[PDB]
Design a protein around this nucleic acid. Sequence first.
RNA 1: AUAUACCGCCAUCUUCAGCAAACCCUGAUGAAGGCUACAAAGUAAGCGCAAGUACCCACGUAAAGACGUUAGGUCAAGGUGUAGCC
Lengths: 132, 343, 218, 103
Amino acid sequence: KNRAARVRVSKGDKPVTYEEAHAPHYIAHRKGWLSLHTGNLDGEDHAAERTVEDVFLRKFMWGTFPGCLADQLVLKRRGNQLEICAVVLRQLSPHKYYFLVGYSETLLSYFYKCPVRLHLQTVPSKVVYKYL
Amino acid sequence: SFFTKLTADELWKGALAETGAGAKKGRGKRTKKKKRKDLNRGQIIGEGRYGFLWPGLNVPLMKNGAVQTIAQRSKEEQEKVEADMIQQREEWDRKKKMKVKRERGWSGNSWGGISLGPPDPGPCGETYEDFDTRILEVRNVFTMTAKEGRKKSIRVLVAVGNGKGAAGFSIGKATDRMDAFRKAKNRAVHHLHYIERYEDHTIFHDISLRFKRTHIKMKKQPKGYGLRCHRAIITICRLIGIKDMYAKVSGSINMLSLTQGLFRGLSRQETHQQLADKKGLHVVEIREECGPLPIVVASPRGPLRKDPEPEDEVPDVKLDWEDVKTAQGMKRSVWSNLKRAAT
Amino acid sequence: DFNDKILNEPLKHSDFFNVKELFSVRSLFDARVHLGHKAGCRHRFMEPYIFGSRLDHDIIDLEQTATHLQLALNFTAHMAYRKGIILFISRNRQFSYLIENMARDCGEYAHTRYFRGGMLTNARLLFGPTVRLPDLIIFLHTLNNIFEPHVAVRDAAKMNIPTVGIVDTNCNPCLITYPVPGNDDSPLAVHLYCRLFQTAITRAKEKRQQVEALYRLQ
Amino acid sequence: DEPWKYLESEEYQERYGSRPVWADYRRNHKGGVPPQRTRKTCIRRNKVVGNPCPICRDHKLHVDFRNVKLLEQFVCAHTGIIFYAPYTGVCVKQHKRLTQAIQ
RNA sequence: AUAUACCGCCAUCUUCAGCAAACCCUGAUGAAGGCUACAAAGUAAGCGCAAGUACCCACGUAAAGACGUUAGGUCAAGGUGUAGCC
Ligand SMILES: [Mg+2]
Ligand SMILES: [Mg+2]
Ligand SMILES: [Mg+2]
Ligand SMILES: [Mg+2]
Ligand SMILES: [Mg+2]
Ligand SMILES: [Mg+2]
Ligand SMILES: [Zn+2]
Ligand SMILES: [Zn+2]
């Protein structure tokens, strides 16, 4: 019996997403990685820094866009460029959405001294993979 | 630290301790339960200690067709806002924790005189708002299994009825109380017996029977009398639509078999049109309010019989010592004639 | 309202579709419907339908047989004129081919294969939410291979569906509405019942057709 | 109002309906059979006791010989005998005030 | 301090294969049971097993291996409920 990034089978009252449904040993076989960087490859370095900073970024953005997201994020770091991709719901106003977008963009840029940019995709209700 | 901080649901799970050692086996705890509370939904995103004025999320972006500017919420302003939020949280908590008043039935903490409301609509579409439900009993049945051992399995008995002579009893078994109620109510509304009644408020004649060592004797009784019977029978008659009778139960007390024998007798009773068309005679009714006047009840639909019944004298009929006692009047007991509640 | 009048018109008339000409005691005796199992295979509720016994073999009363057969044919024909669904059952594998073939020929349906648990009761979950269960069931062989009462009579008595079964000396005519005493086992009897049902349902269908054409004219 | 138009007033109708007044009342008491004689009263020193009877809790009602259709709901239309206080749920004081009023 | 509040993470049977929401039926409508294929009341969402994926193949090895028992271990990876030093 192993409990590691998996859902407990319920009566059928648990909407689960693709990622939250599939197992961690299915990660390379039937999933992708939430981050995409080269610190892990051989010869590179600063992998610890990459991981720490991306975890902090994920937490900060989850808490500065609270209640609107419905899934994990997609990070895409091409050389210097940093790209974020999120899926959110249409809870609040686009005014607030764009205000927080610009706010987080400026904060991340001034913090990391790095060119940052993000995209957000709207959904009426969070997609579900199955009902477990 | 912030890196050590994490999401909310994990903390809520760890605080509630929903499962793992105490929830299983049914041992539970000493009726202590931490109520789930949602904090993110409560406050607006803009609320904080430093009350900067935010045209983006906290303040409307445009006013009088003029763009706004960042401003300050001073000491007494943010204090007013904090007091308002405290009052709002207290109101939400009050509305959260309150009493729950499910109507007292046969007794407190008992599911006897409780009604689940009418059955649910059918899949093809079948509305049963005319039907009223009733939970006769509920019991925590236990049966053991190899690996998990004792399992709690709720069994429930229910009845349903119109108030127009149609009704049905049923049982329901499930691991959950509400699910068992639902199963029982559905298959009850599907399983129903009809019984006739004489003048919308009584049975046609007294019925004495036995069923699984459960002797039961119901006696017809005229208007202005009420229902002095076992409380289960009282609720069942409320569902049926008859307003008054008498009844007695002797021997074992298992209300499942009680209801089964009750419906069996109420179904096997013969109507007066039935009996008249069977025998070939005119039924004649006599009251005490009315004098010596023959009131015909029902006549044979077929050809009437020519000769009348010969007078049956000293009939071979097995009677009851208790009712003979109560008729002779020598019987005495404080427990017989009590001035109970309404019906 | 005139539609209800057309639906109700055949009821007042007796033998309105002329079902009597199909059968006669001559034909029944020729098809050997009058036979019965041994006295050991006798049944209480079937006793009164037994005209007598010979060589410890049971014999059926042909007057009662003809009465019940007339009633059954009349009911089936009224239902067919009402377009009511009809469903045949014959668990006996000796005639499943013929019975399915005549079912195809009639347009009314049949189930000769193994009967599944709760096929009628849980039919909603089995097939779908909205499904029209049949309006009439009939039995060419009331008992199964092991000789128990087929679950279909019980299911029909439960869910209020009428049943018309040919009851042999081993069968239980209590649940049956229109029990027809006869010979469930003989091939002549099976073929004769099938042909009679073909003629009856087809006459009812073509009669509904002609009446509908007459009303479309008028 | 001392007169009996408060009964025809539709607040009475929506508060009760076609049912009698005693039908809604229910007694809190010991287990099984209740006591055989109701409480002495529902009002004391211009103070009301918890779970009072309906005719006492509804102060706008007035028990008098003149309110015939209010008094007749207790005594059965099919038998002239008046129902008892343990039946109708009222205290003995107002019960016997009602019995003398109907007399 | 409390693993006898817990989350998170694992041993165990498991070198198993069953676990099962939702319906129906039998038992006089009791706890409970539902298997007979030349077939007699069982139908099954879903999970698991399995299949496919990784290594050199389709085998093999890994991986996976549910419901639950052992109030199994861990408040000493980390956090947190309760009780305390403050
Ligand atoms: Mg392992
Ligand atoms: Mg109490
Ligand atoms: Mg432990
Ligand atoms: Mg496998
Ligand atoms: Mg392994
Ligand atoms: Mg231990
Ligand atoms: Zn035979
Ligand atoms: Zn009072």
